[PDB]
RNA sequence: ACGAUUAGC
RNA sequence: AUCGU
């Protein structure tokens, strides 16, 4: 979070 | 290196690079007491200097002469120097002292002052006598610092062992030279190397506490001393502030000239002028743009109305068109050997044409680089250069213009043609108004001014006990009790019973001494009167009073930046309308009897005379006094009680004053001197002056000025202003204010020629003028340039310490008390707020530890004392401000930010429990708090800092005599007494304990008492009390922290948007703040600054204005708000304000307005001991604690947050605890909304009652 | 909830400063130098 | 017989 | 400013 403040089945399948 | 090997973890603690906890603290604060001198100046051989470092060293400063050929005895057999440069060559010489040292024993290399001179001298030898004069007199110049010098040194040798710092605000390092660009500090090096030579001891000097040891070597001189705290402070500055090289360097040049001169403290007094007036005093001269602000200060004037209006661009013809400083400033760098300087000054200076952030911090570093120590000298020359001056008038008032005396006062007729007709009916009208005007006649009101002299200090009392015992009249003894017998207090106590006919002889006696020095000026030397002696002089200060409070436009000021009329500068320095600084040269000296008072006193006299016939004033009988005022008749005249003051008064003053001088610094030099001068230390010194500078500039700007005028325009700028729009005095100094009409600016030729006619017109009178036009402002040692406020940097040293006498210094919590008083001091200056915390942190760690065993204090002591700290629990770094409150309010605020974060590091490491807290959870917060010192420090912090010497033993019916004489003096008017018993009767009926401690005029002995044996020195036992205390606090264990804070922290709070922006970007308000500094910058653009003086604001909120001396309003108007929350009968307020001494009905009267009204959150804060930080006080508060903190949720109402309509002061209090947090956090400042309170208002209510029912 | 302080936390109150500042009319015309022709 | 003496705000 | 010398 710092660093980034410091850069800005079978049936359901077929 | 070896730094970094000893000191580890610290640097990366207070760096921002890892954690700061309290073991590495305590290490470091152990490996700081335990460090040789010599190690230090190891350490300090190991830096690795670069060039743009070193500057060329004469040989000059080593070989000095003796100081045989500098002094003389002269007649009345009394040593002092004579002079070789003017009448001001009285200072320390940079003579050698080499042959005056006999080595100490158990060091060899180390010496001090022969005690066969000393002998030689005491029993009368010449020689002797001057040799010991000059050792002690360098002895002194040495011993005007705060601590050893090393000490700082190698803090800031360990806090600038961190390199760099990173900015969370600007996202990028700080680009700060590192220490080998540092000038000043590889001069004091060199400089060290070369004095030490082949011994192998390095330090020039060790600093005791009591007399300092000098090291023996051909290179020691005297000047040497100086030199060094010089260089500490400049190195100390350069890397606190981001002083560029350059002006560094010409610093450093000026000080080595100043070493090699005759003598260092002349010479820096002679060159104290050329930074200000090179750089301050020349800029603009070709202007292109820039901003300042639009001001405007409303037609209500003694209130002082200020409004801000935006920022207008900068017009090219808003040059600077005052008179060039060029021939002077050349002349001066000619004369001195300073050419090159001034010439690399001037050249410098030409180079900024826009009025940017650039400019402003350029002019800080040149006024920062002036030497900045405390000048010292034999007080027997002080004396004898001060106090022998007088005015020289030449034209006096003629003899014909007077009539007979009135006893010793003789009325000036108002046919006279002197000017002194308008000061005498000024002061007249002023006397009238004041006897006719009824508040002067209340009881309270003599009691308040009676006692406002009686304080527990020093008097002159064996003066008045000699003078009085003169007439074979004997005053009472007290022996056996540890009171100090050298105090005005124990003048009042010895005074009581005798009546006035008996003390009135100790009006002329012979004043005693005082005097303490100043940084770049002379010493002041200071009379105090004994108590009758500022009895006597009662109607003066009271009509100078009056003057300064409805007649013109002035302001008493206070002490410090904060409590001060900034605004009223900032407006006189805007470019449309110009100013004009008016200082009085040894206004002192200016006033004696033959023209002010002279006139002064017949004014008062025949003032009052048509008001007041009897009703005698504060213990000062009326009388009869013949006059022979018409013809050849005389009659009797009875006067009122203030006129036997006046006419006792006036022959004080047609006599003159003695002046009783025995010093220590040179034996056999006791003698006395009668002298002309106004007493300086009286009670009406400051009125009267302010009072006399306005009306005589009124009277000029009125009758004098046309009449010796000739051109038009001239004529008619003087007709245009007056005292009462455009005229602010206090005391020396003022400051006049010509504004801009439509055409631009007023022209310079017409002001140049208004300023001599004021330079001819101050010379008749016996005053000279000192007038500065240079298109900036100067005022209470403020300046300010096209709107904008330039901290002196060199105004207040870091190092320096005044003392007068030869006392030795007080313990280690004292000068733990002056460290944080510099970190303040460089807070209100306005430096680089990450390098500042960092040196402020390692001076803290340097000065934390002291041997008796050891003692040490915790951190979080200091934290609890405002110092803000930097990374804590694995937070981001650089986190806090330091506007953050000190004291509760201030924990309270970190904590509660800091809040979440905290539980979860306490959790992540083997801090749980299974019970849950409505604070901090499931974290076992006692164990690690416990384990943290951090009760122990917040516990330690609030103990006394100095010896319980208070309380000491005393045999009895001495004290009770002691306490009846004090009693007797302070209600001589039984009226008063009947009121004060009446008092306390229905406080007993009524009152029935619900406060514990009421304040009331029969304690005011008790305090008295107190106060008095508090000023004494401490005996052994007393600091090893002391020092148990303190032991037994660090080893307790404590299971909670105080209820205030508790109660605190069940407050939750949410921060949504931040406030827009209240002062343009673009504008330089003050020096130092800028993008560079990105703290301050923020907060007070977020903020805004206070565009109103503070002290009538603060005033405005008190119930009383002012009480009797020993009392404080404060304790006053809280007891009377808890006896209004803690449910009580308005009988217990009226009991309570007769207490006080209020008479009945305007104690009922106030007690039934108090009990309904309400009142603004500071009062109601006052009531749980919450007053607004030092800090503070420079921005605007006000607006922030009204608007901007909202105690409705910005959802709605949560049936949580109910405040009941009873104990409706809980607002004020939640208003700061809001407040607190919505300031400490750095950036800008945000507005901060109520979220929760965990036991509801009414439980958190009844919290602070539970506790205000203690105390 | 449970809003501790952080580094971005005060950047986003700086970034909205920032905007609410640069988005007044008068600043958004404001100048301190003169162009080449309003001299003349 | 000598000695750790000071303003006002 | 007398018990410190």
């Given at each position: 979070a710092h660093?980034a403040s410091?850069?800005?089945?079978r049936?359901?399948?077929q | 290196?070896?730094?970094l090997?000893?000191f580890?973890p610290?640097?990366?603690?207070?760096?921002?690079?890892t954690?700061?906890?309290?073991?590495?603290?305590?290490?470091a604060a152990?490996?700081?007491?335990?460090?040789?001198r010599?190690?230090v100046?190891k350490?300090?051989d190991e830096i690795?200097?670069?060039?743009?470092?070193?500057?060329?060293?004469?040989?000059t400063?080593?070989?000095?002469?003796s100081?045989?050929?500098?002094?003389?005895?002269?007649?009345?057999?009394?040593?002092?120097?004579?002079?070789?440069?003017?009448?001001?060559?009285?200072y320390?010489?940079?003579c050698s002292?080499?042959?005056?040292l006999e080595?100490?024993?158990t060091?060899?290399?180390?010496?001090r002052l022969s005690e066969?001179i000393?002998?030689?001298?005491?029993?009368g030898?010449?020689?002797?006598?001057?040799?010991t004069?000059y050792?002690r007199?360098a002895?002194?110049?040495?011993?005007?610092?705060?601590a050893?010098?090393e000490?700082?040194?190698?803090?800031?040798l360990?806090?600038?062992?961190?390199?760099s710092?990173?900015?969370?605000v600007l996202?990028?390092?700080?680009?700060?030279?590192?220490?080998?660009?540092?000038?000043?500090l590889?001069?004091?090096?060199?400089?060290?190397?070369?004095?030490?030579?082949?011994?192998?001891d390095r330090?020039?000097?060790?600093?005791?506490?009591?007399?300092?040891?000098?090291?023996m070597?051909?290179?020691?001189?005297s000047?040497?001393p100086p030199?060094?705290?010089?260089?500490?402070?400049?190195?100390?500055?350069?890397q606190?502030?981001?002083?560029?090289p350059?002006?560094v360097?010409?610093?450093?040049?000026?000080?080595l000239?100043?070493?090699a001169?005759s003598?260092?403290?002349?010479?820096?007094?002679?060159?104290?002028?050329?930074?200000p007036?090179?750089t301050?005093?020349s800029?603009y001269?070709?202007?292109?743009?820039?901003?300042?602000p639009?001001?405007?200060?409303?037609?209500?004037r003694?209130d002082?109305?200020?409004?801000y209006?935006?920022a207008?661009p900068?017009?090219?013809?808003?040059?600077?068109?005052?008179?060039?400083?060029?021939?002077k400033?050349?002349?001066?760098?000619?004369?001195?050997g300073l050419?090159?300087?001034?010439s690399?000054?001037?050249r410098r200076?030409?180079?900024?044409?826009?009025?940017?952030?650039?400019?402003?911090?350029?002019?800080?570093?040149?006024?920062?680089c002036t030497?900045?120590?405390?000048?010292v000298?034999?007080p027997?020359?002080t004396?004898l250069?001060?106090?022998?001056?007088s005015?020289?008038?030449?034209?006096?008032?003629?003899?014909?213009?007077?009539?007979?005396?009135?006893?010793?006062?003789?009325?000036?007729?108002?046919?006279?043609?002197?000017?002194?007709?308008?000061?005498?009916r000024?002061?007249?009208?002023?006397?009238?108004?004041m006897?006719?005007?009824?508040?002067?006649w209340d009881?309270?009101?003599?009691?308040?001014?009676?006692?406002?002299?009686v304080?527990?200090r020093?008097?002159?009392?064996?003066?008045?006990?000699?003078?009085?015992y003169?007439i074979?009249?004997?005053?009472?003894?007290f022996?056996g009790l540890?009171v100090?017998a050298?105090?005005?207090?124990?003048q009042?106590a010895?005074?009581?019973?005798?009546?006035?006919?008996?003390?009135?002889?100790?009006?002329?006696?012979?004043?005693?001494?005082?005097?303490?020095?100043?940084?770049?000026?002379?010493?002041?030397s200071?009379?105090?009167?004994?108590?009758?002696?500022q009895?006597?002089s009662?109607?003066?200060?009271?009509?100078?009073?009056?003057i300064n409070?409805?007649?013109?436009?002035?302001?008493?000021?206070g002490?410090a930046?904060?409590?001060?009329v900034?605004?009223?500068?900032?407006?006189?320095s805007?470019?449309?309308n110009?100013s004009?600084?008016?200082?009085?040269?040894?206004?002192?000296?200016?006033?004696?009897?033959?023209?002010?008072?002279?006139?002064?006193?017949?004014?008062?006299?025949?003032?009052?005379?048509?008001?007041?016939?009897?009703?005698?004033?504060?213990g000062?009988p009326?009388?009869?006094?013949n006059?022979?005022?018409?013809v050849?008749?005389?009659?009797?005249?009875?006067?009122?009680?203030?006129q036997?003051?006046?006419?006792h008064?006036?022959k004080l003053?047609?006599?003159?004053?003695?002046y009783?001088?025995?010093?220590?610094?040179?034996?056999?030099?006791?003698?006395?001197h009668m002298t002309?001068?106004?007493?300086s230390?009286s009670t009406?010194?400051?009125?009267?002056?302010?009072?006399n500078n306005?009306?005589?500039m009124?009277?000029?700007?009125t009758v004098?000025?046309?009449?010796?005028?000739?051109?038009?325009?001239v004529?008619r700028l003087?007709?245009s202003?007056?005292?009462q729009?455009?005229?602010?005095?206090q005391?020396?100094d003022?400051?006049?204010?010509?504004?801009?009409?439509?055409?631009?600016?007023?022209?310079?030729?017409?002001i140049?020629?208004?300023?001599?006619?004021?330079?001819?017109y101050?010379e008749?009178?016996?005053?000279?003028?000192?007038?500065a036009?240079?298109?900036?402002?100067?005022?209470?040692?403020?300046?300010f340039?096209?709107?904008?406020?330039?901290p002196?940097?060199?105004?207040?040293?870091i190092?320096?310490?005044?003392?007068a006498?030869?006392?030795?210094?007080?313990?280690?919590?004292?000068?733990?008390?002056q460290?944080?008083?510099?970190?303040?001091?460089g807070v209100?200056?306005?430096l680089?707020?990450?390098?500042?915390?960092?040196?402020?942190?390692?001076?803290?760690?340097?000065?934390?530890?002291?041997?008796?065993?050891?003692?040490?204090y915790?951190?979080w002591?200091?934290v609890?004392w405002?110092?803000?700290?930097?990374?804590?629990?694995?937070?981001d770094?650089?986190?806090?401000?330091?506007?953050?409150?000190?004291g509760?309010?201030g924990?309270?605020?970190?904590?509660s930010?800091?809040?979440?974060?905290?539980?979860?590091?306490?959790?992540?490491?083997?801090?749980?429990?299974?019970?849950?807290?409505?604070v901090?959870?499931?974290?076992?917060?006692?164990?690690?708090?416990?384990?943290?010192?951090?009760?122990?420090?917040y516990?330690?912090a609030q103990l006394?800092?100095?010896p319980?010497?208070?309380?000491?033993?005393?045999?009895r019916?001495?004290?009770?005599?002691f306490?009846?004489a004090?009693?007797?003096?302070?209600?001589?008017?039984?009226?008063?007494?009947?009121?004060?018993?009446?008092?306390?009767?229905?406080?007993?009926?009524?009152?029935?304990?619900?406060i514990?401690n009421?304040?009331?005029?029969f304690?005011?002995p008790?305090?008295?008492?107190?106060?008095a044996?508090?000023?004494?020195?401490?005996?052994?036992?007393?600091?090893?009390?002391?020092d148990?205390?303190?032991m037994?606090?660090?080893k307790?264990?404590?299971?909670?922290?105080?209820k205030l804070?508790?109660a605190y922290?069940?407050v939750?709070?949410?921060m949504?948007?931040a406030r827009?922006?209240?002062?343009?970007?673009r504008?330089?308000?003050?020096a130092?703040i800028?993008?560079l500094?990105?703290?301050?910058?923020?907060?007070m653009?977020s903020?805004?600054?206070?565009?109103?003086?503070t002290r009538?604001y603060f005033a405005?909120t008190l119930?009383?204005?002012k009480?009797?001396?020993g009392?404080?309003?404060?304790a006053?108007?809280?007891?009377?708000?808890?006896?209004?929350?803690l449910?009580?009968?308005?009988?217990?307020?009226?009991?309570?304000?007769?207490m006080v001494?209020?008479?009945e009905?305007?104690?009922?009267?106030?007690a039934g307005?108090?009990?309904?009204?309400?009142?603004?959150?500071?009062?109601?804060?006052?009531?749980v001991?919450?007053?607004?930080?030092?800090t503070?006080?420079?921005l605007?508060?006000?607006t922030?604690?009204?608007?901007?903190?909202?105690?409705?949720?910005?959802?709605?109402?949560?049936?949580?947050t109910?405040?009941?309509?009873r104990?409706?002061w809980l607002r004020?209090?939640?208003?700061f605890?809001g407040?607190?947090?919505?300031?400490?956090?750095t950036g800008?400042?945000?507005?901060?909304?109520?979220?929760?309170?965990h036991?509801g208002?009414r439980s958190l209510?009844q919290?602070?009652?539970?506790?205000?029912?203690?105390? | 909830?449970?809003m501790?302080?952080?580094?971005?936390?005060?950047?986003?109150?700086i970034?909205?400063?920032?905007?609410?500042?640069q988005?007044?009319?008068?600043?958004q015309?404001?100048?301190?130098?003169?162009?080449?022709?309003?001299?003349?």
């Amino acid at each position: 979070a710092h660093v980034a403040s410091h850069g800005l089945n079978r049936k359901t399948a077929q | 290196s070896m730094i970094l090997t000893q000191f580890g973890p610290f640097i990366e603690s207070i760096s921002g690079i890892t954690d700061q906890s309290n073991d590495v603290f305590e290490n470091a604060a152990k490996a700081f007491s335990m460090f040789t001198r010599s190690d230090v100046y190891k350490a300090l051989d190991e830096i690795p200097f670069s060039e743009d470092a070193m500057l060329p060293i004469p040989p000059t400063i080593y070989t000095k002469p003796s100081h045989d050929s500098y002094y003389y005895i002269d007649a009345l057999n009394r040593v002092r120097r004579k002079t070789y440069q003017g009448p001001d060559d009285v200072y320390v010489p940079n003579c050698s002292i080499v042959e005056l040292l006999e080595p100490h024993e158990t060091l060899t290399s180390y010496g001090r002052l022969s005690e066969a001179i000393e002998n030689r001298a005491k029993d009368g030898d010449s020689q002797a006598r001057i040799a010991t004069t000059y050792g002690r007199i360098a002895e002194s110049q040495a011993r005007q610092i705060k601590a050893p010098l090393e000490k700082f040194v190698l803090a800031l040798l360990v806090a600038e062992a961190g390199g760099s710092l990173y900015d969370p605000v600007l996202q990028k390092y700080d680009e700060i030279p590192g220490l080998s660009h540092n000038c000043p500090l590889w001069c004091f090096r060199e400089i060290c190397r070369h004095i030490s030579g082949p011994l192998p001891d390095r330090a020039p000097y060790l600093y005791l506490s009591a007399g300092v040891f000098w090291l023996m070597s051909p290179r020691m001189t005297s000047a040497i001393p100086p030199l060094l705290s010089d260089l500490v402070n400049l190195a100390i500055l350069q890397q606190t502030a981001g002083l560029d090289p350059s002006l560094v360097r010409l610093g450093v040049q000026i000080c080595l000239h100043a070493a090699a001169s005759s003598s260092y403290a002349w010479f820096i007094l002679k060159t104290k002028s050329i930074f200000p007036q090179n750089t301050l005093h020349s800029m603009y001269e070709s202007l292109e743009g820039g901003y300042c602000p639009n001001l405007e200060w409303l037609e209500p004037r003694s209130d002082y109305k200020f409004m801000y209006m935006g920022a207008m661009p900068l017009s090219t013809k808003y040059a600077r068109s005052a008179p060039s400083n060029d021939k002077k400033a050349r002349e001066l760098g000619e004369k001195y050997g300073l050419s090159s300087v001034v010439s690399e000054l001037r050249r410098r200076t030409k180079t900024y044409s826009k009025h940017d952030f650039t400019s402003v911090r350029y002019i800080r570093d040149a006024m920062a680089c002036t030497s900045g120590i405390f000048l010292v000298r034999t007080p027997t020359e002080t004396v004898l250069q001060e106090y022998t001056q007088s005015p020289e008038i030449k034209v006096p008032i003629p003899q014909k213009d007077w009539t007979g005396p009135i006893g010793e006062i003789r009325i000036l007729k108002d046919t006279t043609s002197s000017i002194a007709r308008y000061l005498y009916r000024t002061w007249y009208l002023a006397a009238a108004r004041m006897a006719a005007q009824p508040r002067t006649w209340d009881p309270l009101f003599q009691a308040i001014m009676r006692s406002q002299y009686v304080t527990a200090r020093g008097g002159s009392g064996a003066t008045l006990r000699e003078s009085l015992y003169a007439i074979n009249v004997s005053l009472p003894d007290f022996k056996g009790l540890p009171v100090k017998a050298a105090t005005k207090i124990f003048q009042a106590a010895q005074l009581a019973n005798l009546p006035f006919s008996h003390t009135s002889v100790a009006i002329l006696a012979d004043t005693s001494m005082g005097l303490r020095n100043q940084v770049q000026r002379r010493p002041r030397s200071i009379m105090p009167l004994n108590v009758p002696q500022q009895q006597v002089s009662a109607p003066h200060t009271l009509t100078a009073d009056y003057i300064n409070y409805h007649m013109n436009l002035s302001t008493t000021s206070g002490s410090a930046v904060i409590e001060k009329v900034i605004p009223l500068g900032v407006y006189a320095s805007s470019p449309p309308n110009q100013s004009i600084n008016i200082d009085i040269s040894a206004c002192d000296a200016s006033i004696t009897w033959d023209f002010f008072l002279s006139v002064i006193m017949a004014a008062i006299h025949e003032g009052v005379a048509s008001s007041s016939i009897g009703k005698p004033f504060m213990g000062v009988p009326a009388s009869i006094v013949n006059d022979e005022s018409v013809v050849g008749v005389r009659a009797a005249r009875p006067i009122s009680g203030m006129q036997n003051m006046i006419q006792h008064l006036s022959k004080l003053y047609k006599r003159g004053f003695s002046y009783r001088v025995n010093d220590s610094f040179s034996p056999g030099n006791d003698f006395t001197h009668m002298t002309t001068t106004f007493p300086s230390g009286s009670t009406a010194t400051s009125t009267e002056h302010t009072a006399n500078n306005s009306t005589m500039m009124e009277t000029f700007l009125t009758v004098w000025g046309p009449e010796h005028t000739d051109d038009p325009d001239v004529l008619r700028l003087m007709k245009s202003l007056t005292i009462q729009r455009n005229y602010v005095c206090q005391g020396d100094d003022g400051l006049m204010i010509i504004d801009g009409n439509t055409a631009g600016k007023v022209n310079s030729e017409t002001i140049q020629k208004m300023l001599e006619l004021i330079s001819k017109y101050g010379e008749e009178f016996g005053w000279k003028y000192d007038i500065a036009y240079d298109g900036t402002a100067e005022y209470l040692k403020l300046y300010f340039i096209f709107g904008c406020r330039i901290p002196n940097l060199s105004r207040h040293p870091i190092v320096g310490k005044e003392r007068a006498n030869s006392s030795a210094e007080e313990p280690w919590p004292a000068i733990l008390d002056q460290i944080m008083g510099i970190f303040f001091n460089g807070v209100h200056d306005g430096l680089q707020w990450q390098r500042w915390i960092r040196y402020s942190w390692a001076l803290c760690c340097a000065f934390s530890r002291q041997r008796t065993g050891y003692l040490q204090y915790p951190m979080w002591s200091f934290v609890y004392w405002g110092l803000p700290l930097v990374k804590v629990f694995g937070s981001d770094p650089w986190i806090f401000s330091w506007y953050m409150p000190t004291g509760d309010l201030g924990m309270y605020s970190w904590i509660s930010l800091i809040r979440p974060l905290m539980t979860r590091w306490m959790v992540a490491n083997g801090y749980v429990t299974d019970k849950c807290s409505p604070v901090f959870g499931n974290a076992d917060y006692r164990k690690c708090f416990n384990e943290l010192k951090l009760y122990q420090g917040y516990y330690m912090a609030q103990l006394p800092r100095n010896p319980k010497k208070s309380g000491r033993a005393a045999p009895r019916e001495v004290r009770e005599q002691f306490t009846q004489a004090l009693s007797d003096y302070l209600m001589q008017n039984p009226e008063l007494k009947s009121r004060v018993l009446r008092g306390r009767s229905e406080w007993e009926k009524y009152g029935a304990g619900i406060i514990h401690n009421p304040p009331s005029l029969f304690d005011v002995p008790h305090k008295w008492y107190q106060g008095a044996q508090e000023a004494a020195t401490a005996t052994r036992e007393e600091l090893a009390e002391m020092d148990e205390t303190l032991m037994r606090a660090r080893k307790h264990s404590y299971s909670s922290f105080s209820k205030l804070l508790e109660a605190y922290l069940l407050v939750k709070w949410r921060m949504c948007e931040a406030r827009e922006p209240s002062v343009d970007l673009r504008l330089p308000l003050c020096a130092g703040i800028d993008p560079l500094n990105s703290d301050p910058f923020l907060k007070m653009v977020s903020v805004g600054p206070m565009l109103q003086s503070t002290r009538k604001y603060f005033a405005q909120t008190l119930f009383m204005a002012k009480t009797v001396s020993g009392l404080d309003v404060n304790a006053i108007d809280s007891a009377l708000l808890r006896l209004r929350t803690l449910g009580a009968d308005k009988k217990a307020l009226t009991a309570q304000l007769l207490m006080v001494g209020l008479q009945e009905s305007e104690a009922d009267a106030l007690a039934g307005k108090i009990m309904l009204q309400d009142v603004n959150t500071v009062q109601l804060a006052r009531v749980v001991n919450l007053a607004v930080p030092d800090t503070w006080m420079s921005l605007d508060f006000d607006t922030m604690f009204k608007h901007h903190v909202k105690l409705l949720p910005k959802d709605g109402r949560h049936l949580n947050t109910d405040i009941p309509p009873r104990m409706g002061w809980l607002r004020a209090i939640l208003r700061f605890l809001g407040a607190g947090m919505a300031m400490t956090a750095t950036g800008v400042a945000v507005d901060i909304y109520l979220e929760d309170i965990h036991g509801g208002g009414r439980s958190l209510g009844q919290r602070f009652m539970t506790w205000m029912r203690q105390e | 909830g449970n809003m501790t302080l952080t580094s971005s936390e005060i950047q986003r109150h700086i970034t909205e400063f920032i905007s609410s500042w640069q988005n007044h009319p008068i600043v958004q015309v404001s100048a301190d130098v003169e162009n080449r022709k309003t001299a003349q």
